[PDB]
Design a protein around this nucleic acid. Sequence first.
DNA 1: GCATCAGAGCCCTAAA
DNA 2: TATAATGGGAGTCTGATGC
RNA 3: GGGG
Lengths: 84, 1111, 53, 176
Amino acid sequence: SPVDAATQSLLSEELEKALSKLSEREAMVLKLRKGLIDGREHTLEEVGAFFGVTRERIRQIENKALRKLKYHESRTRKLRDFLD
Amino acid sequence: MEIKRFGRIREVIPLPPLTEIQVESYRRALQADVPPEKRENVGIQAAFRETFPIEELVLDFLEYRLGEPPFPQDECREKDLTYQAPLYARLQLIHKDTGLIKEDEVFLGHIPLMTEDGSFIINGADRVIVSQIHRSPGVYFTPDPARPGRYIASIIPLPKRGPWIDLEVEPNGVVSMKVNKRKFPLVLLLRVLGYDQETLARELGAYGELVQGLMDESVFAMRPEEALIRLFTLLRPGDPPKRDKAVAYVYGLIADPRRYDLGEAGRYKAEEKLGIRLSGRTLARFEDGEFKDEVFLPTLRYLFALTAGVPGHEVDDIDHLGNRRIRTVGELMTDQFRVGLARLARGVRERMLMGSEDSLTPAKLVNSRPLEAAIREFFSRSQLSQFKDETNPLSSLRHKRRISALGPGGLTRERAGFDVRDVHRTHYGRICPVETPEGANIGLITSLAAYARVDELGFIRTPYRRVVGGVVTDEVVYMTATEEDRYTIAQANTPLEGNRIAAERVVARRKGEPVIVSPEEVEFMDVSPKQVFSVNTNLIPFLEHDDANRALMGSNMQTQAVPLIRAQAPVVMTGLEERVVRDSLAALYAEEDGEVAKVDGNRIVVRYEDGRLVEYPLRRFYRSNQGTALDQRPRVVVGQRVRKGDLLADGPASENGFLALGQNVLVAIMPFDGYNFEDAIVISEELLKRDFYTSIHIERYEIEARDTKLGPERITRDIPHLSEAALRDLDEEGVVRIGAEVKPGDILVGRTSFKGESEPTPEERLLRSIFGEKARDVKDTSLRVPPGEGGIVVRTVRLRRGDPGVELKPGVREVVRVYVAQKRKLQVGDKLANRHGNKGVVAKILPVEDMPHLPDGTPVDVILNPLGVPSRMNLGQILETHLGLAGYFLGQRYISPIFDGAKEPEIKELLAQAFEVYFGKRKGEGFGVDKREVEVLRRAEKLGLVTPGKTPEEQLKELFLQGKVVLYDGRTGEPIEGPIVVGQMFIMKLYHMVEDKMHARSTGPYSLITQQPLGGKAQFGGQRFGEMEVWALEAYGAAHTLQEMLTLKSDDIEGRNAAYEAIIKGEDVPEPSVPESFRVLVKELQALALDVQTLDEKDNPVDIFEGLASK
Amino acid sequence: VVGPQLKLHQCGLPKRMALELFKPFLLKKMEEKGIAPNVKAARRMLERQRDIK
Amino acid sequence: TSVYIEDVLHEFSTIPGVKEDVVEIILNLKELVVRFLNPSLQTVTLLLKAEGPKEVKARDFLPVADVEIMNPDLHIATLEEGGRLNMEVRVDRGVGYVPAEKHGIKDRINAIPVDAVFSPVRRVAFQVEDTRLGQRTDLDKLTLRIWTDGSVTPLEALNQAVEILREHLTYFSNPQ
DNA sequence: GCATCAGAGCCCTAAA
DNA sequence: TATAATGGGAGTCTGATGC
RNA sequence: GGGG
């Protein structure tokens, strides 16, 4: 519906406008983990490749990505309403 | 208060039972209370006798019985069940090849039962079967429009029980027969009957050129057998004319008392018209191996003598109510029963030619599915089976007495013309000339007249009193229209002294034609004026003063009156308002004499003389089909002495046993600052304060929890992402608590459903990961209050699977129903009406201080604009107000019968007595005439209203006798410059209320194929901007408004999505793209193998699918 | 319903109708002043009739 | 302004032993005229408990200090052998006509809001008659007839009306 | 001539 | 997969235009 | 089947 189309556009727009205000790069490691229009969810194996670091570390900047996201979120609490 | 009744007409008989057209018809059809051996061959019985015995083995019908209903009526309505009885039939199997006899009683399913008041319960909802008018079977003769001197004889049987026959006499001189649109010379059929040239010459011949023209030599050159084979080839091009095959076809079409049924009414009309006597209901017989004629020769005989001009031969008026008959509930149902029975017979014969010709009983041989389906089909989907109108008791009473000319065996709108819709002279006393729909259906749907009854043959009869010499007896004769035309019938109001006609000249009718006649010539006399009009029309006082077109609206709108909590009977009644409540069965009465033992809100217990203690439970706040509240209230007190037939409880819209469709309000007839404009109505806030025009309404909400391939829906209080504030009024299980105010958006029943492979998107997965909360297994599918609805929760019903007594449709675990009530105060946009067709919507509610008021301080209730009266020509409302003024001060209500009523002098007498109370009080209280009363009197004497040179009291009294009073404007205090009509009027709050009708949509549901908004308020629909609306925008040259209508506001998907996004961002809406329904058109034309190409100016194709449809 | 007090260019429009018809416009304005933090929250407030201030 | 009847969740209920339905009961409570003797008292709550074959009238309300029931003869409910009635009625002072939907007053969860006609004035008429000071003619003799329910008296009403009208004319003081 | 075909006002409600 | 079995059942009125 |  018009509302739904609008919402999906708005969610994607705040999602990228949120990964770059910490850093584009630790947001780049994390962005690779879920995938915006990819659905790039596996686990420990494949992650061997191009993040920039080796392999256990990304499972940490993932926590640090999610943690830095979490603090910054309480201020820009605009994503709360997308929880329906 | 006093009830003063006018009128001198002594009505010799009371109104018949008003629902008898329903009750008597169905009782006759079922004969459940008759011991089988004593049943007459009619209804269900006649159907069985017609279908059986079933030939090859012979299956014969013994008798049927009807069981008791598995569930009572209340239970059926609750559980969405049909109220019905089990039908069984005792059948004996006989082997014609042997001697074997096996007998068993087989279960044929259920048959729906009619309740006491003449309605049905079909799947839990109350229904009415509307009677159907149609052409009576028989033999008719009409003039041939083509040849101004020749005639056509038409033999018409019962619907679906045979072909229509036409006997035109062709230009060549030979008498032709038309059957199933095929024509041939009738002489051939005559030869098949065993006729010889001698019989036709000797029988007829008297007509020089006509009888010889039927004789054709080639046809005579063959015995009756050759003529039968010869005719069959003329009818079935391609079927070999085998002698047994030809006989079978002609027998079934003409002589078979199974495939061809003239009516029982058909038999009487045929015997009577042609002066013959019929051995049965068929046009011919198969007897002693050949065919023997019954009808054809007498019909041919009558036609030739008419073509000539022989005395005793007339054309038939096909709209005459002697030639038009009613098919009542019983007959309609029995036709479908006979059809369902015949289908079952196909099954019997097919099963008797398979699986061992011996090892079969009647129980295995019979499949009742065809019978059950025919009956279930009639009650659910027939056009004559309608959802009951039970807005008020009169609604349903009127519904049951309606007469339709449409439906399965009748006209269509696309197919009905003036002759049928007309008011025939024979409608007099039988069908109401007033009560018919406005619009396309005018004249097709009508209402049974008050004193009319349908006889056993189906013709409507009306009562008349015999007049012998000049003395009027009390013996009443019910006449059909055909029989009425014989006599000279005097009007019901013709003067009488005792039983003698007291006038030298009386007003009478002969064949409907009005004629002045001497008392020596008077054969009969009308019973009453009430007999000419319907029940609704008879409820209109002073009807003789109302133009019929407005009286029509008056009738129909009483049907729409909403039951009010303070409902009152009108101060001016017609005397029918008691009978309507009693026959409606809404009100409760005492069976025998007795004493009232107990009185409760819920029940009344009566101790009779018999000693038995009878408990009458009361229906309390039950929701009718239209959501108006049917609620009964106790009218007696503990220990009250009652006689037989005394009132115990009031039903809805009844006050002490009198029909109460509205309230009696004090009305002023005068313009008021344009709030009165074009039928709008101004009302006083005092009406809401004292709860006038307040009505209770109940809405039903329902929700199912079903098994899905994704897992069970559950009705639960646990709903994802909702605050406890939102769930506050829900019980442990997720249902809203009884006695809560629910408003739009509120949860009624909580429900969860399992998420599709839509299993939350990776965008949503990452969002959910941020808040520590995992996306839940279930989504919130809860039932909520729609926009504009809500009220107090008065009841909840929960039905699960696995609870005693309940099993739902497959897959459905549980069903919850929530009943929500609302008290509706009158508001702006609600519609009011009186009984004379004055109707208007409430446009303004003024505070009591702005309302015009009498000098003594009494403010008026309603202000009606006088501009509604003169073009409409309904003056009865005016007389109603005047007599209503008298009654306000005299403390009385009146019964003024229609056409024998209160007349002007009589109303003036009452008005004078009222002025003394309105004024003499003042002179005694130590107050004299007002200054402003003098000013108005000055202006009134300039109007010729009062006599110049009289005291103010005398002049005010002169005005009061004209029903006009001095009126003060509550705003100024200054008088209205002229005397104004003020009095008591009966006004109803109709079922059309803004609360129900106000609707708006920004965006909402779209249609599957067209991607255009759905329609209707209940779907949250958009308005239709149709062809004519587009034309308006075109004529304005509003190109961008129109384009918005065609794209962004409808099916342009990219456009509607993009426009919404722009508005919430504060940008202007984007230029539209292609409407999706144009793409549908393109693809639909391709499915028809047509290549549709959008081209640019260079004639190169433009791809409006943006690459998606090309490989 | 008749509105005698109206000027020729005017009509009476129920406020509840107007809230739906102009709903997208109303959401943007509810953000611009501040009745709600953003557009999505504003819509949630109009859904329940008692949440309407 | 509000009614709580024991074992009653909403207005569309009905009480065993009572003849009148709750809708009618509240309709009868709307006719109750209750006078406050103490001018500082803005709200009270009347109690009623009745049983047996009695016709409850307005007298049967349990008496409260500084509150007088001006119409103790008003019928409330007809009770029959075994009929039990227990209620708490909240009565308020206010102005004009405030409908039940407007105030929504509930002392407890099951309370039923009631339509309030606050105005004590039942009817107002005024006569204007001719008079003279014997020197001059067409002078006016004004007679104001004032009917009230008794909570306030026709004279007190007239003074409040005049006081309102005077107070209104003050507003013309400060221009712009 | 006679048959065959395609026409026959708009918006809205509720029931299925 | 093997007695033999062999042909079906069912229902208005307009005006314009091509045989 | 109701409404304009």
